[PDB]
Amino acid sequence: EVKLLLLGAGESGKSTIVKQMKIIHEDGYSEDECKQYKVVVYSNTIQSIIAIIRAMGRLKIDFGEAARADDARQLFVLAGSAEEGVMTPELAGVIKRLWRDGGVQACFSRSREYQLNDSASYYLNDLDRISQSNYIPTQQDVLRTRVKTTGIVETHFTFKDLYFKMFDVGGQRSERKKWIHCFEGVTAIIFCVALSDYDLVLAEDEEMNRMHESMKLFDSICNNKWFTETSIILFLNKKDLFEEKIKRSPLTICYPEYTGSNTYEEAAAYIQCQFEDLNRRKDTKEIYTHFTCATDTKNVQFVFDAVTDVIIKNN
Ligand SMILES: Nc1nc2c(ncn2[C@@H]2O[C@H](COP(=O)(O)OP(=O)(O)O)[C@@H](O)[C@H]2O)c(=O)[nH]1
């Protein structure tokens, strides 16, 4: 019996990782469980096109054809029509006109300014597929949904003649997350990092950028007495998002002191070194890191297998 504690910031992928364990070692998401996620996939898409809409307002963006103005109005009229997984085709057509319009797209490339779900461009492009009345979410659709994680989430599976209990803490509040109870002991920690988060944009109240806050969280998690012989596994996740982001936005955004160039590999190893250098601990406590795209069931599968061989080597 192995104990995996799943720790990360917000929107870091932990529910995506749990959903991946249920896919990979459990039987996976049956059609019924997909059908439940119908309404999630819907309201994710709606809140997301709404998000970009409202942010056209504050970033001062216009609609490529002003014909879209009333389309905007109609959105908010039928925003709740999809309460019960019923996307009327009127609602569909509105979301398509809006997403296809230029100015909406301009605000969306600005994206990093107004904060919007990572799986937005996904559903929004594949909207034709989704808008069928009889559409069933693909497994990748369920993996793309953001449901926000309430209390303490648990998962039991078996792998390689070994029982595993995984716990997503979530908690939705950085101090409610305290739960040092679970902290005591624990086979292995899985700290998850939203790479794509470097270039995000400081809030008014926000002291440091998201990336730095996560680094502090990791520094306290690793350099903890409870996790001395805990195996520490860092997922530098959303490598796909981050890989896309380096082209348009420099890593100088997050770390200013970075004199290396804005390429995938340099920036990725520099973030890696940034996190790994927080460990003041022994040479017996060497952090194990992997770069990861948690929505890729195959990528996860392979990573997690190398992870288990690590955890085994400790016992
Ligand atoms: N496109 C993409 N989305 C990801 C990746 N990893 C996680 N996500 C998405 O990130 C969003 C936040 O993940 P979530 O499961 O809520 O993480 P949590 O905050 O730790 O519970 C979800 O919509 C996931 O679908 C990735 O590598 N690529």
Question: Would you list the DSSP string of 203-243?
Answer: -SS--S-HHHHHHHHHHHHHS-STTSSSEEEEEEE-HHHHH
Select from 78, 109, 144 the last residue of a domain. 144
Give 283 Cα–ligand 1 centroid separation in angstroms.
Answer: 32
Give the domain extent around 257.
Answer: 2-25+159-314
Select from 144, 174, 200 the last residue of a domain. 144
Burial class (CB in 10 A: 0-12, 13-18, 19+), 228: exposed
Residue 48's CB is within 10 A of a number of other CB atoms, namely 23
C-alpha 53 chain-centroid distance: 22
State the amino acid at position 94 in one-letter form: V
Residues with Cβ within 6 A of ligand 1?
8, 10-16, 117-119, 143-146, 149, 170, 237-238, 240-241, 293-295
Which atom number of ligand 1 is nearest to the Cα of residue 145? 23
Measured in Å, how far apart are the chain's first and last C-alpha atoms? 11
Residues 180 and 184: their CA atoms lie apart, in Å, by: 6
Residues 287 and 233: their CA atoms lie apart, in Å, by: 6
Residues 13 and 6: their CA atoms lie apart, in Å, by: 10
Burial class (CB in 10 A: 0-12, 13-18, 19+), 78: middle
Method: X-ray
User: Residues 166, 293: one domain?
Assistant: yes
Nearest protein Cα to ligand 1, atom 25: 144
Q: Specify the 3-state DSSP secondary structure of 111.
A: helix
Residue 124's CB is within 10 A of a number of other CB atoms, namely 21
In eight-state DSSP terms, residue 114 is T
In the chain, the number of structural domains is 2
Question: Torsion angle of alpha carbons 285, 290, 294, 300, nearest 10°?
Answer: -90
- CB-based contact 129:93 (threshold 8 Å): no
Could you tell me which residues are annotated as the binding site? 10-16, 118-119, 143-149, 169, 171, 237-238, 240-241, 293-295
User: Residues 13, 80: one domain?
Assistant: no
Q: For the range 123-131, what are the long-range contacts, defined as Cβ-Cβ under 8 Å and sequence gap of 24 or more?
A: 123/41, 123/44, 123/45, 123/48, 124/45, 124/48, 124/49, 124/95, 124/99, 125/99, 127/45, 127/92, 127/95, 127/96, 127/99, 128/96, 130/41, 130/42, 130/45, 130/87, 131/87, 131/89, 131/92
User: Residues 308, 291: one domain?
Assistant: yes
Active-site amino acid positions: 11, 16, 146, 168, 172
- Two tokens at 151? 């209390």
Torsion sign over Cα 116, 119, 125, 129: negative
User: Residues 49, 8: one domain?
Assistant: no
* CA angle, residues 264, 141, 6, in degrees to nearest 5: 65
Give 303 Cα–ligand 1 centroid separation in angstroms.
Answer: 16
- CB-based contact 92:99 (threshold 8 Å): no
Give 16 Cα–ligand 1 centroid separation in angstroms.
Answer: 6
Residue 171 belongs to domain with CATH number: 3.40.50.300
In a mutational test of the pocket of ligand 1, which residue from 48, 118, 214 has the highest number of ligand atoms less than 8 Å from its CB? 118
Resolution of this model in Å is 3.3
* Helix spans in 60-101 (H): 68-77, 89-100
User: Residues 112, 166: one domain?
Assistant: no
- Two tokens at 32? 């019924």
Give 180 Cα–ligand 1 centroid separation in angstroms.
Answer: 25
In eight-state DSSP terms, residue 159 is -
Residues 245 and 315: their CA atoms lie apart, in Å, by: 39
State the amino acid at position 51 in one-letter form: A
User: Residues 194, 308: one domain?
Assistant: yes
Which atom number of ligand 1 is nearest to the Cα of residue 44? 23
User: Residues 67, 133: one domain?
Assistant: yes
- CB-based contact 197:210 (threshold 8 Å): yes
User: Residues 169, 205: one domain?
Assistant: yes
State the amino acid at position 265 in one-letter form: E
Is position 149 within any domain?
A: no
Torsion sign over Cα 262, 273, 301, 120: negative
Side-chain-side CA neighbours of 153 within 13 Å: the count stands at 19
Burial class (CB in 10 A: 0-12, 13-18, 19+), 262: middle
